[PDB]
Amino acid sequence: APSVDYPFQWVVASYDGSEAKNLSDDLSGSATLTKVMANYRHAELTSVELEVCPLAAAFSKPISVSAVWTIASISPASASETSYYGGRLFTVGGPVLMSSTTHLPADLTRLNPVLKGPVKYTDCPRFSYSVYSNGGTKGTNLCTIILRGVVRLSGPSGNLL
Amino acid sequence: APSVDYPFQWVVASYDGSEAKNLSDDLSGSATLTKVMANYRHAELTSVELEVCPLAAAFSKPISVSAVWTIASISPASASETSYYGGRLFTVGGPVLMSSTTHLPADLTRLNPVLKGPVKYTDCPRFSYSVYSNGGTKGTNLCTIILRGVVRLSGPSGNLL
Amino acid sequence: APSVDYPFQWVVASYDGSEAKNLSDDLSGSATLTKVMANYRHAELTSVELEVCPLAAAFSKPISVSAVWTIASISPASASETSYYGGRLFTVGGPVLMSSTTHLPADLTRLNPVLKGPVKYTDCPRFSYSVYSNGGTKGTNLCTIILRGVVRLSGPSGNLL
Amino acid sequence: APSVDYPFQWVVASYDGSEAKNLSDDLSGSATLTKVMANYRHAELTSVELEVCPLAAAFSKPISVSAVWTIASISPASASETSYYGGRLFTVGGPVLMSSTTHLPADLTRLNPVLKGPVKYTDCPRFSYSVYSNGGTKGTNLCTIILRGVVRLSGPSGNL
Amino acid sequence: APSVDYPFQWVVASYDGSEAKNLSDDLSGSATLTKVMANYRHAELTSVELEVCPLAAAFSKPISVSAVWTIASISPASASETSYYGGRLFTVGGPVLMSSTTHLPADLTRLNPVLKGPVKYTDCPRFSYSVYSNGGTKGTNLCTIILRGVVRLSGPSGNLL
Amino acid sequence: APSVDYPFQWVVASYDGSEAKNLSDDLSGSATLTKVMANYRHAELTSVELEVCPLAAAFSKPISVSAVWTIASISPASASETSYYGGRLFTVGGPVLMSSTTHLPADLTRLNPVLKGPVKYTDCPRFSYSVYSNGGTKGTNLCTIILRGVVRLSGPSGNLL
């Protein structure tokens, strides 16, 4: 079946260290990807990764974020991402807002790349992260969580234009 | 180059014989197709056509629409579609409320099917039509215009969504 | 056709964090490259990348710059570069003005390398970046945006010597 | 595709050495040639040249005209046609009042013959000339610049 | 080594018989060719020639120019080009305002075509000419000198622009 | 001809940010390499690079140095190294005096490796750097510029022992 590799990117959420914020999301049910896959019947993840970009305000005040790419069935709790395989702890800020170590790629060999199809899969990739309570300012938004990846979309459906 | 044959269909508008209404539109600049194919680098028509579907109110009051599929460079004036080659004059209504004779398909062998690509072609299809007033009630909506076709889309772009 | 690989480099612009500055530029229409390609009829990008070099004054005050290499048709808005695929957010400064992570290479597989030819292409690479409002000093110019790349130039024209 | 070879010829302009006059024109945008090819989708040159024909009044007063054929991207400045490759400095007048050496043909193998088509080209032929004043008395018209050639027109369009 | 045959043409100057004017120039040090080929590592002439084009004012007042294409080492003095082998003495004007006999081509088999390269050759072509005064009006510009030719340029350098 | 690969290293110069200092040097004419190549007739650069080692005093005060490896013919001016291809801007200091990004290797494919031979080449590598006016102390010497490389030396001459 003919298909196109569709690259996507969006800032998942901007965060400040005012309080701990936990977000766990399944890529099959994400609102901003379902609009991309609404026009196609089949979608398979070629690649995807979670990026934590530091912002300039984080230079003097780092933020620690614990992130993990788990299976759709498993939903890790808040501040428990490092207890699962592949769970990493990213400290953004300090004097070096340069390192690319803040990338967390999804191991699509251990996950089901199919985000859409004839059936709803229970093994789709699900990204869960938790931002810890830092000093906080309530307005700086000195951290950013971003998703980028590629989805192979096939079988366009007769949806709205 | 991998590509998908995207079938599109949408109602251009609904018209009644309250006043004469002219609408000319280049398919490369149509808002609906633009929002469909702004996420892809290349788009090429495989088929496209205009259709004038009669409604129930047209049963007792037929309405006449003059339509033409001209080149991108040529922009027909209002109520002058019959003065261009291929310009048909459909009349929808009466006891015959269903007929395939009101379909006007574009000659993609004569026109240029490419609506998007590396270069800006000047031969894209452009559909022009004029609906003549026959005594509508400003809300009766005697007829409706539907544009349906298929676009082969290749090379998805890293767009906003 | 005989051709020469022409390496080019110029500081695109020096910036201080006094206010947010957004620059989007198409390499086909850039003034400082058109002088290089004025003497040749065909120009094709072998490679090109956008570099954000920190300056010493940025050591105590970092700057965040959001940059993206998009298609010529797409013109991302200010502070929206991270919402497009390949859009990166570079934080220059801090205690480490060393990392080479500030390079943003153009994906010439997803872009048209031809910056000049018989026709004007609508899919040339276009670099769009936005410098955010930092503390600012109005005179330090504590960040630099630089373009370097290689253009294969062929078919010299009878222009001015 | 069916096509017809349209031979065109028109006097670009008559000049006298009253003052220096510069004219640069792209054949895609030439109004006379554009209205010639206004009813066809495609138009491609087969030959074109710029002729500088002396007049009788130029017998005692030659005119110097510097002319060049370039691509549409390159637009020569006034009185600078000899600084571009192929620019030639013609002189019309004197005892020799008729010569084929005053005709400058366009190298359509180097330029792009297509003046009209699906895509607007940036390397279409453009002719730029400059006429240098010698002291003409505002009415002599010692020389005439004439452009003639053949354009093949294909794919008529119903622009009625 | 990839290279391009760059055709160059420019007017050296315009002369009138107001006073005798001498100009000797080595092609490796000519300002116009230097600004052309300062962006390339290697440059080699394929052809080059001097030409004395008569103007309209020369019709009633011919002017004489003595020209020579000597070696880089030899620098002819003023009004002494006829004393060197190959030194021609052209006279432009009169009823014959057009003639190819006033072209002086360089003998690149005798001279050294290389104007730029790894080593500094001492055999580069050098053109010398002297225009004799015949009674010009300080603004009439009886004749003009044009240098035209082709340079094969290889190995572009990372220059300023 | 028999030859030996001779590795060389010397601190080119130690600098403090008291004032801007510009040094451009050709490796064929450098005093400290000519003593190595004085005993041999032919010398060809296998490799060479310019290293900017930060010193401990630079930890609290970084220095920005703009360096470039150009051709022998091209002599870049002060503070204009980033305008040439391969021109880099090195910021030494901060909290991370570790990164090896301060190395600037010479692209010997684009340069003539021969530093000595029967003829004097005009395309030898030439390194030009400029140290900008930092805060300055006049005695710390909180930056170091060092050259290391390898020269293949062949054909020993009857010089002094």
Side-chain angles (χ1 to χ4, degrees), chain A residues 7-9 11 53-56 59 94-100 144 146 148-150, chain C residues 59-60 62 64 81-87 89 91 93-96 99-102:
Chain A
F8 62 88
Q9 203 214 50
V11 174
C53 292
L55 299 202
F59 151 78
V96 284
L97 283 73
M98 172 45 227
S99 293
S100 56
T144 42
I146 301 165
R148 53 161 80 71
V150 180
Chain C
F59 151 78
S60 50
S64 196
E81 281 77 41
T82 50
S83 296
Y84 299 73
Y85 190 62
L89 180 82
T91 302
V96 285
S99 293
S100 56
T101 56
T102 47

Side-chain angles (χ1 to χ4, degrees), chain F residues 10-115:
Chain F
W10 76 85
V11 174
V12 163
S14 194
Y15 286 111
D16 51 68
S18 45
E19 69 275 16
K21 315 280 287 280
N22 164 75
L23 186 84
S24 183
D25 188 61
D26 190 11
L27 291 177
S28 302
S30 65
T32 186
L33 262 179
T34 44
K35 65 179 73 174
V36 164
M37 316 178 306
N39 315 277
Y40 302 85
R41 280 175 72 139
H42 189 70
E44 192 207 10
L45 262 175
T46 299
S47 86
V48 70
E49 62 86 20
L50 194 75
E51 167 65 9
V52 186
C53 292
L55 299 202
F59 151 78
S60 50
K61 174 182 271 313
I63 297 169
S64 196
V65 173
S66 86
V68 71
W69 278 100
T70 52
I71 200 68
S73 308
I74 297 170
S75 186
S78 63
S80 291
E81 281 77 41
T82 50
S83 296
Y84 299 73
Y85 190 62
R88 304 241 300 270
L89 180 82
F90 298 101
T91 302
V92 289
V96 285
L97 283 73
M98 172 45 227
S99 293
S100 56
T101 56
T102 47
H103 290 268
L104 187 54
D107 195 11
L108 280 178
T109 62
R110 294 191 311 121
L111 308 162
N112 190 18
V114 186
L115 301 188

Side-chain angles (χ1 to χ4, degrees), chain E residues 13-39:
Chain E
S14 297
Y15 294 81
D16 62 358
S18 298
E19 74 272 15
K21 284 282 211 93
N22 175 46
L23 188 153
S24 183
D25 191 84
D26 187 6
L27 278 190
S28 296
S30 48
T32 318
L33 294 174
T34 308
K35 77 173 91 153
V36 175
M37 66 182 179
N39 306 316

Side-chain angles (χ1 to χ4, degrees), chain E:
Chain E
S3 67
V4 294
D5 291 331
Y6 190 97
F8 66 88
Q9 187 196 249
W10 44 281
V11 170
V12 179
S14 297
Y15 294 81
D16 62 358
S18 298
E19 74 272 15
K21 284 282 211 93
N22 175 46
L23 188 153
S24 183
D25 191 84
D26 187 6
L27 278 190
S28 296
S30 48
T32 318
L33 294 174
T34 308
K35 77 173 91 153
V36 175
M37 66 182 179
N39 306 316
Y40 302 82
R41 280 174 82 196
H42 189 82
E44 183 178 1
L45 287 168
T46 65
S47 70
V48 74
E49 62 155 0
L50 269 179
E51 201 206 330
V52 191
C53 287
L55 299 202
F59 165 71
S60 48
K61 177 170 276 322
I63 206 171
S64 184
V65 182
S66 63
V68 74
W69 273 100
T70 53
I71 199 68
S73 314
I74 297 169
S75 183
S78 183
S80 69
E81 283 75 32
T82 42
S83 315
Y84 299 75
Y85 201 54
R88 291 269 311 112
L89 176 73
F90 318 97
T91 298
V92 286
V96 179
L97 290 152
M98 299 274 258
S99 66
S100 168
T101 44
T102 51
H103 296 62
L104 194 57
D107 200 353
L108 293 186
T109 58
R110 174 201 201 81
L111 312 173
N112 189 26
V114 183
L115 315 172
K116 205 192 201 223
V119 287
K120 203 89 69 173
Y121 295 112
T122 59
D123 303 298
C124 300
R126 157 197 287 283
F127 67 95
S128 301
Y129 64 84
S130 312
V131 188
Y132 307 148
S133 59
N134 64 0
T137 71
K138 279 78 182 178
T140 189
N141 273 7
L142 304 172
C143 82
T144 179
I145 308 296
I146 297 89
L147 188 81
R148 60 156 68 75
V150 181
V151 292
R152 174 141 41 221
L153 306 161
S154 67
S157 305
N159 215 4
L160 201 43
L161 271 43

Side-chain angles (χ1 to χ4, degrees), chain A residues 1 12 18 60 79 104 109 117 121 130 151:
Chain A
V12 163
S18 45
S60 50
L104 187 54
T109 62
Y121 289 113
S130 186
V151 292

